[PDB]
Write a structure and sequence with these properties.
This protein is mostly helical. The chain is about 85% helix and about 0% strand. It is classed as de novo protein.
Length: about 280
Amino acid sequence: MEIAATLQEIAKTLAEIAITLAEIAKTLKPESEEAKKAEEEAEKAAKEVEEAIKYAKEHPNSLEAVAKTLQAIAKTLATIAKTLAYIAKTLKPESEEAEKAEEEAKKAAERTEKAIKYAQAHPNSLEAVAKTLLAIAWTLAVIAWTLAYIAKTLDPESEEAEKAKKAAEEAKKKVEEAEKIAQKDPESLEAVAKTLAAIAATLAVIAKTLAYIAKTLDPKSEEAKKAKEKAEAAAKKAAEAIEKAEKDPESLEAIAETLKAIADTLKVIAETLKTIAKTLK
């Protein structure tokens, strides 16, 4: 269908997400240098997203356009994970899980830095695409784990908090299986489809966890209540695409449908995050 165009939409939504998350950090800690750095890095990521989108529009349907957009997506997710771990550290400064989130986000950024290095040395290679996609998947797994920790911190007595933790662990297992498949044959579409499937499953967990957080932060907000059904519909859409991707892992149609589900889930996440950003003000 429209692989390259859908990646441009994914990159744009992630840039908006990074900016909103930096606004939340500044709302929680107005005088902190970390929230200042979060805003500066989110702006830098948005600039690289803009540059990649303009480059791809001029080189339609090319491996280079795909690689450059995936690199912007990976860098944007790296700063999201770092800023989110800082937020988790703000809620419970002396908690060991907060220190673990910061360490996990740092390691995800190093993996992202190494994948981009390889991709820049092999811009005409599918191995570069699969490597960058795996860095994206691992960073999303860190985000999902950190977000489930935040959810548990707001209401440790809640069954939904443990459901988010278990869901994040299952998405991590999907990333681990994708990394195994890609390592065995990184120049096949199988590696791309299975890694995209893990990404879609992880974003589905994130969207449902984020909708729970919005509702917990503002039980009387009608916008926050609506995020549950919206995240569930996006999660069902991802589940459909994942089933196609594991049925025909070398299908271009399966790859396209999975990218569409990723883009749609990110739109729900971005909307939900905006509701949270207003709640905290």
